[PDB]
Scaffold this motif. Structure first.
Motif, mmCIF file in Angstrom:
data_model
loop_
_atom_site.group_PDB
_atom_site.id
_atom_site.type_symbol
_atom_site.label_atom_id
_atom_site.label_comp_id
_atom_site.label_asym_id
_atom_site.label_seq_id
_atom_site.Cartn_x
_atom_site.Cartn_y
_atom_site.Cartn_z
ATOM 1 N N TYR A 70 0.823 -1.347 -0.024
ATOM 2 C CA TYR A 70 0.139 -0.242 0.021
ATOM 3 C C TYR A 70 0.934 1.238 -0.007
ATOM 4 O O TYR A 70 0.120 2.219 -0.184
ATOM 5 C CB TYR A 70 -0.893 -0.031 1.124
ATOM 6 N N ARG A 71 2.152 1.162 0.180
ATOM 7 C CA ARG A 71 3.016 2.295 0.130
ATOM 8 C C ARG A 71 3.219 2.358 -1.257
ATOM 9 O O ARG A 71 3.955 3.486 -1.513
ATOM 10 C CB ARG A 71 4.349 2.075 0.888
ATOM 11 N N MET A 72 2.765 1.917 -2.317
ATOM 12 C CA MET A 72 3.299 1.803 -3.637
ATOM 13 C C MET A 72 4.525 2.315 -4.037
ATOM 14 O O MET A 72 5.018 3.040 -5.019
ATOM 15 C CB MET A 72 2.477 3.361 -4.143
ATOM 16 N N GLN A 73 5.460 1.227 -3.427
ATOM 17 C CA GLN A 73 6.852 1.193 -3.916
ATOM 18 C C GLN A 73 7.142 0.686 -5.191
ATOM 19 O O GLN A 73 7.980 1.338 -6.185
ATOM 20 C CB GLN A 73 7.521 0.422 -2.826
ATOM 21 N N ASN A 86 -10.705 5.522 1.651
ATOM 22 C CA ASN A 86 -9.808 6.570 2.690
ATOM 23 C C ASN A 86 -9.697 7.829 1.847
ATOM 24 O O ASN A 86 -9.961 8.854 2.765
ATOM 25 C CB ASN A 86 -8.462 5.944 2.864
ATOM 26 N N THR A 138 -11.234 11.153 3.563
ATOM 27 C CA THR A 138 -10.411 12.301 4.024
ATOM 28 C C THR A 138 -11.076 13.529 3.503
ATOM 29 O O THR A 138 -10.935 14.602 4.288
ATOM 30 C CB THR A 138 -9.194 12.110 3.768
ATOM 31 N N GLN A 176 0.076 1.072 6.213
ATOM 32 C CA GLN A 176 -0.083 2.623 5.735
ATOM 33 C C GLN A 176 -0.214 2.938 4.370
ATOM 34 O O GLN A 176 0.409 1.966 3.609
ATOM 35 C CB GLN A 176 0.892 3.281 6.776
ATOM 36 N N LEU A 177 -0.360 3.894 4.222
ATOM 37 C CA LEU A 177 -0.291 4.498 2.836
ATOM 38 C C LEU A 177 0.768 5.470 2.540
ATOM 39 O O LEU A 177 1.227 5.908 3.649
ATOM 40 C CB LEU A 177 -1.885 5.411 2.461
ATOM 41 N N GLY A 178 1.182 5.409 1.398
ATOM 42 C CA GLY A 178 2.253 6.582 0.968
ATOM 43 C C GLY A 178 1.876 7.677 0.690
ATOM 44 O O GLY A 178 2.699 8.498 0.976
ATOM 45 N N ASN A 228 -1.138 9.651 2.299
ATOM 46 C CA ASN A 228 -1.921 10.429 3.679
ATOM 47 C C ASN A 228 -1.866 9.517 4.709
ATOM 48 O O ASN A 228 -1.440 8.295 4.612
ATOM 49 C CB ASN A 228 -2.892 11.114 3.252
ATOM 50 N N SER A 229 -2.623 9.572 5.788
ATOM 51 C CA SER A 229 -2.839 8.941 7.048
ATOM 52 C C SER A 229 -4.024 8.163 6.762
ATOM 53 O O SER A 229 -4.858 8.261 5.787
ATOM 54 C CB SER A 229 -2.942 9.730 8.142
#
Ligand SMILES: CCCCCCCCCCCCCCCCCC(=O)OC[C@H](COP(=O)([O-])OCC(O)COP(=O)([O-])OC[C@@H](COC(=O)CCCCCCCCCCCCCCCCC)OC(=O)CCCCCCCCCCCCCCCCC)OC(=O)CCCCCCCCCCCCCCCCC
Ligand SMILES: CCCCCCCCCCCCCCCCCC(=O)OC[C@H](COP(=O)([O-])OCC(O)COP(=O)([O-])OC[C@@H](COC(=O)CCCCCCCCCCCCCCCCC)OC(=O)CCCCCCCCCCCCCCCCC)OC(=O)CCCCCCCCCCCCCCCCC
Ligand SMILES: CCCCCCCCCCCCCCCCCC(=O)OC[C@H](COP(=O)([O-])OCC(O)COP(=O)([O-])OC[C@@H](COC(=O)CCCCCCCCCCCCCCCCC)OC(=O)CCCCCCCCCCCCCCCCC)OC(=O)CCCCCCCCCCCCCCCCC
Ligand SMILES: CCCCCCCCCCCCCCCCCC(=O)OC[C@H](COP(=O)([O-])OCC(O)COP(=O)([O-])OC[C@@H](COC(=O)CCCCCCCCCCCCCCCCC)OC(=O)CCCCCCCCCCCCCCCCC)OC(=O)CCCCCCCCCCCCCCCCC
Ligand SMILES: CCCCCCCCCCCCCCCCC[C@@H](O)O[C@H](CO[C@H](O)CCCCCCCCCCCCCCC)COP(=O)(O)OCC[N+](C)(C)C
Ligand SMILES: CCCCCCCCCCCCCCCCC[C@@H](O)O[C@H](CO[C@H](O)CCCCCCCCCCCCCCC)COP(=O)(O)OCC[N+](C)(C)C
Ligand SMILES: CCCCCCCC/C=C\CCCCCCCC(=O)OC[C@H](COP(=O)(O)OCCN)OC(=O)CCCCCCC/C=C\CCCCCCCC
Ligand SMILES: CCCCCCCCCCCCCCCCCC(=O)OC[C@H](COP(=O)(O)OCCN)OC(=O)CCCCCCCCCCCCCCCCC
Lengths: 99, 69, 53, 121, 140, 459, 56, 54, 347
Positions: A60-63, B12, B16, F44-46, F48-49
């Protein structure tokens, strides 16, 4: 003496009554089951399952997404002779400087 | 894991946006309320800070002993 | 602080004595009845701040 | 006193007739549930002070505690909501009636707004 | 009180050091007189002469603190040519604290008074510069 | 976040309704289950929170702290059941209740979305901690320790409350998202200087900052084992989290106002390491090590670069785990000999082998030994400080040398040598104590395996 | 017997039912923030033939 | 450890403040409970409030 | 004293306060003050002893002087305006006289000495009624005349009250004197917020009344008038000490307890009007109150003091009289922070 105070008690040893004591409780059955639940839940469930869950959490960090996007942009820009890294983040046409 | 435990990024993102809209509206309302309170207390021409004055229904308009009231 | 029982119940416990332009016995006028009446009528219904200004 | 002396205010009136046009609180309101929780805590403390079994004894008394707290909480929530609605109504009316005091401003985009940049180094 | 404060403020910050000293001495004398009056009221003296001696001691301590503060602050601002600078007030406050310590014959009291009074005087100067108000007028 | 908040509020009635001998089992099992559930927040996301609602949100900085808190609760339960055997049932339940309340307050503190709600919760965390210290401490100095802890924290935090309400009146909102998007530069004026001072000083006292730190040795030495574990592992991280949150609105004034705090932090890091060199008490040695590491974190937050923030977060997590483990080991030794003096008991390696192994591993992690997350965080902070200036490397090198010196000195004094002859009540280590040490140490190595989970949002 | 087991082990469902209730309340909180659903410029799309909302 | 931690960092912040508060508390609470004394105090306060507050 | 006479005197005290709070005439307000004092003196002297007599004498002297000053202010105001209605006062000298008179009635500094003296002199029930009701009435008068209050004078007296309460409570050991100095500090807070938001004044009054009722009723339950007498309560009824500890923590303003809400709202309201130095000093000075609350809590609950031998007989016996609304007061004084926005209902 200035008080009617109890004498300081002797230290109580769990190994005296129970030679195979795990140090959790005085009652042997409660002590054994406390050890079993602590070891099982903590080590097995939390350690192993949480570690593998964290290892296989979705990206989900889109690395990898960012790497693929950068590969595409580099390919397109170097194919067309454009600079690989753009000089400005925004558009100076859309930016209006004070006189 | 993504199918079972988590949702898509759109949820999300748009939650937001809604949260930010609510909070920005609240901040605007708070500042406006402060300005309105200041003006109403300074001037006295609004429903707030209307300190009581004497009611004019108490005045007796019947003729008195003396002609000049 | 101020519980307006008099206004709520329609009673009159001291409003007869609050001012000197109210009903006086034998219709005896006050010394400054006209001035007090004018000031009260001017200041009625606008509140303390506008009344003072 | 901000909203005391407001025109048309009936003295000693917990809830006026103009509050009937607002949505009443839901019976499952979180604030009503918290009032019930406070009542239950009061009942438990009563049992503890009188040295009865805290969770077992006096079920009727605990029920009365909870019910009374929920009743008063419902009415209190109605009054609180009415007062806040009144404040919002007055604020909006004043802003509407004083445009020279609350003027609309032209919105400048960040491309036209100049902000100083302070590097972090 | 308000008249004395207004006189002190109306004297310009960097000039008329003797006038600044006189104004601060008057303020300190009034403060010491009030403190002595309360001390006499709440802890009665054993005699009239003892009461007068205590009153004189308190009033002179306060007046000396005020004079030292005003002199030091005005002189520091004048020599540094830097009006509207809290450092002058800090120096004046610590000088007043040292004066209090000398009056009470205590190095520890002197040091603590220097620190606290210097911080307080610097805060007063910053408030005068920035518009800080202690008893803010009601609004909103 | 309610899926994690509500199970704690259900730990409360379960603890109070369980049988007299099942309290520890139930509390431990369900605390472990809650920790497992809270592991799901690390996704977690890259961009936002994680915005759960208008009240609670989670970020890459909040998530590891929540996981650490939830994992720390059952360890505190194990240590407490070690040292509270002869307590009455009601007092055992009250102890567990204080621990549960503290965990709930910490969870809501880390997940709060407004600065004022964050303030209310992070000030509410004082009451259970003070009660625990001053009620279940062993020695006389627990009362003075509680007074020092309480009044230091409150004297720090009250100007923060004034500044927060002032900022809300000025800007319209204390929501973190709004104040991040609507941030404006802070002009160099006395008013802005004092607002900066109010906020920063509150969190610096919570850190603690050198010169504002005496309450830390006082409280950590005199608190029970659970109180010492939570005080060092989590409660010291509220100051760092708050500083990483509030400094959004304090720029560019932080560039000029950080000099006294940076100098204090660096010199006090050196001073507290040197103090550790000459400590006659084991708990005091561990407490001053905590002070040194938190001084390093303060340096990172003040220099305020993306490489420093990652180091700050990694060092916070690593220090929490390591200090908790060290306190547990010292407490086991204390339960053996009923004294805190370091040189009273020796030869514990020849009397207790596996505990010697645990001491070795914990002391190796206490100093920055690669590739542990302790070293990762310390190295990132050192690199950022080097880019800041080129004598910070001198100070950091001195600190690392002294840290290794005192860690290995503690290990050598307690474990190696010849056993004290007259100490003949050193019974073999319990399975409970060994399991506690294992549960402290294994997650740290797993974090070393996966380091991107504790490097914060700046990763 | 079995009755004594439930008499003593009815507390072990408190935390699980609390977790279930917390998940339900999280869903309830999410369903009140559906003001920009399928309306963000980045994620706006046409609805599929057999769906009513983009997310719940 | 000795000069800074145990002595001067204790003296500056927590010890000096505690000593000042203790001294002020003794001064405030050390009253003989005499109506004459604190009524004379009331008179002084009334005079000061009349003159200095306009 | 006969029960009928006692209940009619209590009814007369309440009638005087209600006359004060409903009257629109200055003469009727003064009459209410006089009626309250006249019926309050025997309540103080209910349990006859020289200490009670001295406390009642001092209370009478102080309240009579305050009433004389208040009537002088009323007459002076009438002289320059010819108005009897209680509104903004039309003469600054009359307003200053009224402010000082009401401060002397409330016990604000420097008119505070009589509060600890009288509270120590009189019993626990008398002290409870004194603090609560006799704070209740003059505050209503001040709220009515708030818009003409001199902010400088009011804030000076409020800050003096906070400082004096903190220091006196630091020194004291008697529980009644501790409660008196706590009352002085809380009155200081209320009158400090008074010139800005009478709603916040009323909120602080209500929370203070709840906490004081809970604390005084716990003291009545445990029959403790000193610190050491309270130190034996853990050996007879340990629950009372726990409730007293949480109430003491609440009174110190610790979050998330109810005592934090008035301080928080008052600081917010004062900062809205560009007051920063005053709220910061007021917040920092409450640490003295918290210190002596914590010192009291160490002796009662968090530590176990030595007991005596007849405590065994006390164990064998059970408390007979039931306190009315004690659990409700204890809950309301510790767990109403989430219900904060009800102050709009209080508005
Ligand atoms: C025991 C009591 C419960 C028994 C079981 C439930 C019975 C009733 C069932 C029912 O009707 O359910 C429907 C109802 C669903 O409501 P809804 O209509 O769907 O919500 C939509 C609303 O329109 C809008 O909802 P919202 O999300 O906008 O909510 C607004 C919220 C927004 O508020 C905030 O943003 C701030 C909230 C905190 C403010 C104060 C912070 C500082 C103080 C901390 C605490 C100090 C005291 C300790 O403000 C409030 O709720 C105001 C009051 C704040 C506290 C609310 C507490 C609710 C539970 C009451 C019992 C709590 C017991 C705790 C201890 C338990 C020990 C066993 O369910 C509940 O209300 C149940 C709540 C959870 C109950 C279990 C306990 C959880 C405790 C959590 C503590 C931390 C949070
Ligand atoms: C439950 C979580 C609560 C969270 C906080 C919420 C607010 C408080 C709760 C409300 C008040 C509760 C009752 C208070 C008095 C309790 C007295 C007592 O002995 O209690 C034992 C009692 C059972 O014992 P028992 O056989 O009846 O009688 C034993 C004797 O009392 C034995 O007598 P003893 O002579 O042996 O007593 C000696 C003991 C006596 O000690 C006590 O009595 C301590 C407890 C009372 C202290 C004050 C409580 C709080 C009052 C409000 C203040 C603010 C609270 C929040 C503070 C936040 C910051 C800290 O004294 C000491 O140990 C002295 C040393 C310790 C002193 C220093 C520590 C003081 C801590 C004070 C704060 C505690 C806050 C948490 C509440 C803890 C109690 C529940 O257990 C309970 O009352 C448990 C709580 C109620 C459980 C209900 C469960 C219902 C069914 C399940 C519902 C599931 C959820 C609903 C949804 C549906 C799902 C399916
Ligand atoms: C709108 C409201 C307006 C209200 C105000 C109305 C104003 C108009 C009033 C019109 C006339 C009123 C007529 C009725 C008055 C009734 C007086 C009465 O019965 O007094 C009884 C009362 C005590 O009765 P007692 O117990 O039978 O007598 C004891 C013996 O005297 C034996 O005593 P001892 O052996 O213990 O010692 C003798 C002496 C020992 O006395 C002392 O130690 C006091 C020393 C005072 C020195 C004052 C220096 C002033 C300097 C001004 C600035 C210039 C530069 C100074 C530079 C430094 C110099 C060193 O006294 C004491 O120790 C008693 C303690 C209290 C002494 C001071 C009393 C005055 C008030 C407190 C402030 C005093 C001034 C403090 C300094 C600051 C001044 C701004 O007598 C006195 O206080 C003295 C005699 C009466 C004088 C009244 C003067 C008018 C007051 C107004
Ligand atoms: C005493 C000698 C002294 O000045 O030592 C300063 C020195 C600070 O280190 P530094 O490297 O000399 O400071 C760099 C520049 O000198 C000053 O830096 P800059 O000139 O670049 O501008 C930044 C300056 C901007 O200047 C100002 O804001 C000055 C205006 C008044 C500030 C009042 C601060 C109140 C809040 C703190 C209260 C507790 C202290 O910031 C401050 O003044 C920060 C104030 C807080 C300092 C540290 C507070 C914790 C002390 C812990 C130990 C206490 C024992 O030591 C202390 O402050 C602690 C020991 C003395 C107390
Ligand atoms: C056809 C006839 C029908 C009649 C129906 C009845 C009509 C109403 C009758 C009311 C009862 C008769 C009078 C008895 C006294 C009335 C008291 C109350 O009703 O009056 C209201 C008063 O209500 C109360 O003030 C609100 C009580 C709020 C209680 C909680 C306070 C909030 C604390 C915050 C934390 C809460 C924690 C949880 C609390 C449980 C408004 O009166 P108001 O004339 O305008 O007050 C003037 C004084 N002001 C202006 C300074 C205010
Ligand atoms: C005890 C409390 C802790 C110790 C104090 C912390 C260190 C303080 C060091 C003094 C700070 C100096 C600086 O902050 O202010 C200078 C002068 O300091 C002040 O005048 C004194 C304030 C009180 C200082 C208390 C500590 C005592 C320090 C004494 C020596 C420091 C002065 C050295 C020459 C400037 C002027 O700097 P300037 O570039 O204008 O920026 C000010 C902001 N402006 C632009 C809006 C005006
Ligand atoms: C804000 C922080 C300011 C930082 C400076 C702190 C003060 C540094 C000086 C402290 C060292 C002085 C000293 O050692 O003696 C203090 C001295 C002696 O008491 P001790 O018995 O030695 O204290 C030990 C308590 N167990 O006590 C004092 O502090 C003197 C009283 C101070 C005078 C009052 C201050 C006046 C300030 C006026 C404006 C406010
Ligand atoms: C028995 C001991 C004393 C404790 C009693 C607890 C229950 C008291 C209430 C009983 C039920 C009353 C009732 O009918 O409530 C219904 C009402 C919601 O109904 P309604 O909103 O109309 O329908 C849903 C619409 N969507 O519900 C509400 O309005 C809820 C308001 C009350 C909230 C209470 C919160 C919990 C309090 C603690 C309960 C603990 C019970 C423990 C029992 C132990 C027994 C040994």
């Amino acid at each position: 003496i200035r008080l009617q105070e109890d004498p300081d008690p002797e230290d109580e040893n769990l190994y005296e009554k129970n030679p195979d004591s795990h140090g959790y409780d005085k009652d042997p059955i409660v002590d054994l089951w406390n050890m079993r639940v602590v070891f099982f839940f903590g080590f097995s469930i939390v350690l192993v399952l949480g570690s593998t869950f964290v290892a296989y959490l979705p990206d989900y960090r889109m690395q990898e997404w960012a790497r693929r996007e950068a590969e595409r942009l580099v390919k397109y820009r170097e194919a067309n002779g454009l600079p690989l890294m753009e000089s400005n983040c925004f558009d100076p046409n859309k930016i209006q400087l004070p006189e | 894991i993504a199918r079972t435990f988590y949702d898509g990024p759109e949820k999300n993102y748009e939650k937001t946006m809604a949260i930010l809209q609510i909070e920005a509206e609240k901040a605007e309302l708070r500042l406006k309320e402060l300005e309105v309170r200041r003006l109403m207390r300074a001037r006295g021409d609004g429903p707030w800070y209307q300190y009581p004055t004497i009611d004019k229904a108490l005045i007796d308009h019947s003729p008195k002993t003396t002609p000049d009231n | 602080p101020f519980f307006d029982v008099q206004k709520r119940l329609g009673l009159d416990l001291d409003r007869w004595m609050t001012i000197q332009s109210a009903e006086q016995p034998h219709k005896i006028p006050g010394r400054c009845h006209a001035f007090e009446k004018e000031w009260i009528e001017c200041a009625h219904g606008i509140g303390g701040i506008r009344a003072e200004k | 006193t901000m909203m005391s002396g407001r025109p048309g205010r009936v003295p000693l009136q917990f809830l006026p007739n103009e509050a009937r046009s607002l949505p009443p609180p839901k019976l499952t309101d979180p604030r009503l549930v918290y009032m019930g929780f406070l009542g239950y805590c009061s009942g438990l403390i009563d049992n503890a002070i009188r040295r009865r079994p805290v969770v077992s004894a006096g079920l009727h008394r605990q029920l009365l505690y909870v019910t009374s707290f929920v009743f008063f909480g419902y009415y209190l929530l109605k009054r609180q909501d009415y007062m806040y609605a009144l404040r919002d109504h007055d604020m909006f009316a004043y802003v509407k009636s004083h445009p020279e005091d609350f003027p609309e401003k032209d919105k400048k985009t960040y491309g036209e707004i100049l902000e100083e940049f302070h590097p972090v180094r | 009180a308000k008249t004395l404060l207004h006189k002190y403020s109306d004297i310009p910050e960097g000039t008329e050091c003797h006038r600044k000293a006189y104004a601060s001495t008057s303020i300190g004398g009034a403060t010491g007189l009030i403190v002595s009056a309360y001390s006499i009221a709440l802890k009665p003296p054993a005699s009239f002469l003892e009461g007068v001696a205590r009153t004189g001691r308190y009033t002179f301590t306060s007046a000396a603190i005020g004079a030292i503060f005003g002199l030091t602050s005005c002189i520091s601002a004048q020599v540094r040519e830097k009006p509207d600078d809290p450092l002058n007030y800090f120096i004046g406050g610590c000088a007043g604290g040292l004066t209090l310590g000398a009056r009470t014959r205590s190095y520890g009291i002197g040091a603590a008074a220097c620190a606290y009074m210097g911080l307080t005087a610097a805060l007063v100067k910053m408030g005068q510069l920035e518009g800080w108000q202690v008893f803010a007028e009601p609004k909103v | 976040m309610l899926k994690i908040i509500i199970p704690t509020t259900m730990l409360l009635p379960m603890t109070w309704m369980s049988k007299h001998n099942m309290i520890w089992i139930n509390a431990t099992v369900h605390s472990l289950l809650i920790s497992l559930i809270s592991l799901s927040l690390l996704n977690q996301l890259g961009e936002n929170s994680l915005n759960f609602s208008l009240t609670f949100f989670s970020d890459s900085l909040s998530a590891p702290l929540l996981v650490l808190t939830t994992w720390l609760l059952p360890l505190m339960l194990m240590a407490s059941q070690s040292h509270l055997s002869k307590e009455t049932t009601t007092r055992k339940k009250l102890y567990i209740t204080m621990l549960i309340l503290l965990q709930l307050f910490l969870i809501m503190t880390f997940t709060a979305t407004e600065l004022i709600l964050f303030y209310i919760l992070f000030e509410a965390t004082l009451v259970p901690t003070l009660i625990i210290i001053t009620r279940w401490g062993n020695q006389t100095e627990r009362l003075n320790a509680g007074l020092y802890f309480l009044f230091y924290t409150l004297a720090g935090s009250l100007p923060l409350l004034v500044a927060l309400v002032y900022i809300q009146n000025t800007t319209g909102s204390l929501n973190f998202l709004i104040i991040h998007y609507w941030s404006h530069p802070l002009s160099n004026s006395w008013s802005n200087i004092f607002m900066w001072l109010a906020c920063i000083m509150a969190f610096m006292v919570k850190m603690p900052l050198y010169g504002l730190h005496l309450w830390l040795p006082k409280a950590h030495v005199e608190a029970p084992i659970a109180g010492s574990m939570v005080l060092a592992a989590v409660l010291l991280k509220l100051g760092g989290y708050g500083m990483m949150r509030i400094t959004t609105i304090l720029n560019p004034l932080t560039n000029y106002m950080a000099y006294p705090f940076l100098m204090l932090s660096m010199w006090g890091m050196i001073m507290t390491s040197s103090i550790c060199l000459r400590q006659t008490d084991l708990k005091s040695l561990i407490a001053y090590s905590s002070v040194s590491h938190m001084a390093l974190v303060i340096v990172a937050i003040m220099i305020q670069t993306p490489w420093s923030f990652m180091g700050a977060t990694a060092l916070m997590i690593a220090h929490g785990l390591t200090s908790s483990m060290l306190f547990c080991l010292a407490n086991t030794n204390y339960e053996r000999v009923h004294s805190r003096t370091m040189i009273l008991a020796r030869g514990l390696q020849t009397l207790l082998p596996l505990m010697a192994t645990w001491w070795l591993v914990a002391s190796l992690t206490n100093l920055a030994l690669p590739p542990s997350i302790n070293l990762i965080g310390e190295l990132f902070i050192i690199t950022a400080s080097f880019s800041w200036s080129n004598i910070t490397i001198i100070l950091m090198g001195m600190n690392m040398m002294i840290t290794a010196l005192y860690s290995l000195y503690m290990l050598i004094t307690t474990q190696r040598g010849k056993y004290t002859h007259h100490i003949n009540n050193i019974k073999p280590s319990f399975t409970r104590e060994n399991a506690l040490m294992a549960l402290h140490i294994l997650p740290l190595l797993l974090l070393t395996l996966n380091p991107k989970m504790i490097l914060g949002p700046l990763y | 017997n079995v009755l004594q087991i439930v008499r003593d082990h009815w507390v072990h469902i408190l935390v699980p039912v609390g977790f279930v209730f917390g998940c339900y309340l999280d869903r309830r909180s999410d369903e009140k923030l559906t003001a920009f659903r399928n309306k963000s410029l980045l994620f706006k799309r046409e609805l599929r033939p057999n769906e009513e909302v983009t997310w719940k | 450890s000795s000069l800074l931690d145990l002595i001067w960092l204790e003296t500056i912040l927590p010890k000096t403040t505690s000593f000042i508060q203790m001294k002020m508390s003794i001064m405030v609470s050390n009253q003989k409970g005499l109506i004459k004394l604190y009524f004379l105090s009331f008179l002084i306060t009334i005079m000061i409030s009349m003159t200095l507050f306009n | 004293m006969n029960p009928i006479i006692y209940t009619t005197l209590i009814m007369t005290v309440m009638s005087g306060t209600m006359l004060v709070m409903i009257s629109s005439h200055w003469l009727l307000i003064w009459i209410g003050f006089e009626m309250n004092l006249l019926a309050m003196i025997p309540v103080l002297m209910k349990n006859f002893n020289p200490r009670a007599t001295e406390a009642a004498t001092k209370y009478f002297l102080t309240q009579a002087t305050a009433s004389m000053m208040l009537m002088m202010a009323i007459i002076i105001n009438l002289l320059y305006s010819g108005q009897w209605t209680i509104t903004k006062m039309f003469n600054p000298v009359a307003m200053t006289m009224m402010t000082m008179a009401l401060a002397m009635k409330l016990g604000l500094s420097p008119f505070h000495f009589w509060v600890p003296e009288v509270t120590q002199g009189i019993s626990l029930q008398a002290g409870l009624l004194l603090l609560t009701w006799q704070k209740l009435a003059p505050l209503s008068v001040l709220c009515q005349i708030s818009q003409s209050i001199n902010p400088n004078l009011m804030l000076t007296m409020a800050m003096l009250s906070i400082l004096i309460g903190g220091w006196g409570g630091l020194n004291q050991t008697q529980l009644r004197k501790i409660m008196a100095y706590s009352s002085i500090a809380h009155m200081g807070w209320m009158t400090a917020v008074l010139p800005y938001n009478t709603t916040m004044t009323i909120l602080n009054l209500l929370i203070y009344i709840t906490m004081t009722l809970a604390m005084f009723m716990l003291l009545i339950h445990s029959s403790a008038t000193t610190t050491l007498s309270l130190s034996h309560t853990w050996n007879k009824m340990p629950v009372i000490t726990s409730l007293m500890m949480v109430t003491l923590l609440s009174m110190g303003g610790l979050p998330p307890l109810s005592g934090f809400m008035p301080k928080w709202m008052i600081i917010q309201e004062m900062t809205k009007n560009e007051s920063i130095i005053m709220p910061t000093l007021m917040a920092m000075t409450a640490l003295l109150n918290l210190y002596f609350y914590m010192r009291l809590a160490y002796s009662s609950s968090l530590t176990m003091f030595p007991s005596t031998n007849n405590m065994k007989m006390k164990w064998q016996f059970e408390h007979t009289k039931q306190m009315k609304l004690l659990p409700t007061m204890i809950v309301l004084s510790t767990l109403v922070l989430p219900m904060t926005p009800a102050l709009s209902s209080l508005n």
